[PDB]
Amino acid sequence: ITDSLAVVLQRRDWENPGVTQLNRLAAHPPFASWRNSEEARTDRPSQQLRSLNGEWRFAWFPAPEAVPESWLECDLPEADTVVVPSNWQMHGYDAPIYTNVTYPITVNPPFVPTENPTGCYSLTFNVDESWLQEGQTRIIFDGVNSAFHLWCNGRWVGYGQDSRLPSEFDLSAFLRAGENRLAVMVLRWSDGSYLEDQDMWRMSGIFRDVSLLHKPTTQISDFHVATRFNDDFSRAVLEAEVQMCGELRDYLRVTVSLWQGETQVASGTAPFGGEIIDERGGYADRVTLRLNVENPKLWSAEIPNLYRAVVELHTADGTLIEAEACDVGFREVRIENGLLLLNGKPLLIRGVNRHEHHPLHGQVMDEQTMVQDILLMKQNNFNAVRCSHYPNHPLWYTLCDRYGLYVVDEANIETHGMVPMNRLTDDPRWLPAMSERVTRMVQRDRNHPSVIIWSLGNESGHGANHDALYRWIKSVDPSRPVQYEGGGADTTATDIICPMYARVDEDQPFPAVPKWSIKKWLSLPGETRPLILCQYAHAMGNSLGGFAKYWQAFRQYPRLQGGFVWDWVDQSLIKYDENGNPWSAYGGDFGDTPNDRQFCMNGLVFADRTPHPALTEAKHQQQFFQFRLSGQTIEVTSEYLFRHSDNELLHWMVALDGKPLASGEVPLDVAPQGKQLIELPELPQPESAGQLWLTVRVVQPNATAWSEAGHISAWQQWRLAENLSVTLPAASHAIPHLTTSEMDFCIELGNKRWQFNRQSGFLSQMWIGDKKQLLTPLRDQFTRAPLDNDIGVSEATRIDPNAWVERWKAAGHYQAEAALLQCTADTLADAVLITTAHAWQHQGKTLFISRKTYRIDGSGQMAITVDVEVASDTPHPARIGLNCQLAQVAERVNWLGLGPQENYPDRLTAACFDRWDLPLSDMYTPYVFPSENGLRCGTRELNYGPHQWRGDFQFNISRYSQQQLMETSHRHLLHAEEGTWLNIDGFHMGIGGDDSWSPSVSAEFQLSAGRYHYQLVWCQK
Ligand SMILES: CC1(C)C(/C=C/c2ccc(O[C@@H]3O[C@H](CO)[C@H](O)[C@H](O)[C@H]3O)cc2)=[N+](Cc2ccc(C(=O)O)cc2)c2ccccc21
Ligand SMILES: [Mg+2]
């Protein structure tokens, strides 16, 4: 009767932060209850841990009150069969909602809409007679979003909250021999939802693994593993605290053994009975075993050395009762004289924030995707990952233990959308709900070596509950620093100054919560802590402009120890069009309103894990080898802390304007933090015009667990000698002819002709035979299809006048019409020369003036000179160049300049000057929200079809006009236009990225000069 839905739902436990659970079992490190010690040692499956993943029955309801009572005792006929784990949104049952700060429900704590989508999962399953005769059978829900009641065989078992930590219940008294039925009622919204306002898709369901665990009545209930060292790390002590439940008997003993492969390194045995704690005695149900280990192999992300600990509960008889185990990493984390140290050395954090996202399965994680993420991270020189912003799938910490990544483990607490952010975290009545989110994380993950820093959550202001739970962790686990960014990044609840989007040089003095220059922040009076940015370099679309500025400062300042980029992967989701072709969706593409559109996509990699261009810029700046050149000696500095360069070659190549002359390879032998001098053999010194370039690459000859043989780890380029060309062009055998109309100036030379419209003032057509070459005239361009960083948070709903796109729009940059001031022809002895002069205006104010000269000579080459004035009081323009739409569509693009990948003025350090030859496809970057893209910088020669351009310019080349990109909201709606659109810019504004909601382009990358000059030569070859 009291099992009925009517009575259980009556209490409304999901609108009460004083009930976070009912009858839920205590939290602990991962268990498997092996009944054989060698299976435990080898980490092989345990027949005491069943998976209940697979096909369940599921049914959707608009509110829990709509669930019929029949559902408790038999399957609903309207129910479907569904795979678990899953998010029910990904099966089309209701919409996923993408909102950033604003809560997806009315803010009215602790209450929740009565429209509360409800997932009714059920499973019929068998249990062996063995499990019911002896011991304890429990069920483990690794992840239920956001709360749930549990029935088994019609009887109510319990209730659970916190979406990202395992909820476990005892099923012993509820199971029967043979057929049993689980009934799990999952609520999309709960009072827990008030602490789960992370900027991400809001989904729901049983989205992590479901398991049964069988333990004996007398059991290992908890164990903690600590490692302490002497000053030089030549000796360690492993302390293992083991706790038990059940009937204590004097014959009970515990053995803890430490292995390294098949070598047993130490072992101890003891009865239960701890040291004296206070005036009432000690813990009779606990024992600590202390093992000596001489010259331990130490854990780091550089070399992830692991031991294995095996904990046997047995009798004096030797009868094994059960065994648990974990991997062990010998490493020490401490902050000492203002620096974060690991094994006595200062870490430099090459970090990234990473969400649990999959474009098809939503927030369900798999081993394959996890491994793919880790490989991609290490291959791009990433040290560390921040679990933003919740405890991860348990397998993640095992994988980072083994592959070697430093992990920040973060409690599932974000209250961003409250006003102020403080509201719940400063309120004592919410302390219990918060403590369970902090304490149960620590109790689960404290034995993982890869976790080096605990975090109290994200974006919840600073309340007294943070201070309380900061001190809880410090008392319970001294071995790791605690950090938290809320309330100004330097509150009393953080051992590390952990700002988000603090800039390098520029102060943002917001009241109460300023973001100082990270350099100035360190020096403020009384401040002694290190500074590691919790989030930095917002990688939203065409971003990471200014990334090198950070890493220069990280390398110069000891107490700037890096940061975590925001963030790893685009949170795009897959939809299907009328033909079943997939496309990538973002905010509002599911009827979800209100939403925050494209802001779900901030990754360095697309959702399928293909890299954005910015990934290589990060790889370059975060490389572990630094290079200097004096003469033709190379100084290689290693930023590794623990390992020699014992899988590294240096390849070097010298080349003249792309043409290789000399190469060669040198073994690399640099000690950690050491230097190696390499003198290069006598290098070529040709008399040829052009520029000589030295390029070095570090190459790993052997495969790793994370990379292929031949993997490139770092690179650097220097200009050696230059030779300015002095030679006179070969004399031509003909002079071009000028034909003057009232309408046109036309120029002829051989089969070639050039037409200059005298009404417009632009080169409107060019001929080679009967084949015309332009579909659009060659005109000036002072605008770009705005990037995410240009737009910021501006919408048609609420315009943000301060963003770049809106200052451009307000000033008429986008609707300015060219007004010709001058267009004259002149014949001279060698060539014909057209001079032009245009003004761009808007409502009586002149924005730009453009003075040009076209010189067509007997060699068939058109020399263009441009001299642009920009009014001092108009917003600095996005670019200064020319555009046109060619008739040609060639397969290839050949250029000499920075490449091969997309690069922009404030993000070109990773690009190298060489001859690059790619398909036209690769000259467009398929950002899901389309914008300016594919620019290549510092180019001297561009080759497309019969055409060739020469000068010193930046260019993009595509089948997509700047008009189409600016007007199209999704990449999958783009259509190839007739021919090819070409933008050639003398100058181009930076892209920014320090954040994506305020102007972020540093002054030195703003086109502020007032007058500009660039020069081009158009020819056919
Ligand atoms: C913290 C800061 C800088 C902020 C807001 C910060 C923010 C915004 C969005 C965020 O979303 C996401 O969350 C994810 C975590 O779950 C990630 O962190 C990710 O990075 C983001 O996509 C996060 C922080 N503003 C906005 C603003 C608005 C306008 C102006 C202006 O024009 O003058 C200036 C400041 C203000 C305004 C006054 C004082 C302080 C701020
Ligand atoms: Mg509750």
Ligand SMILES: [Mg+2]
């Ligand atoms: Mg947030």
Ligand code: NA
């Ligand atoms: Na540093």
Ligand code: NA
């Ligand atoms: Na975001």
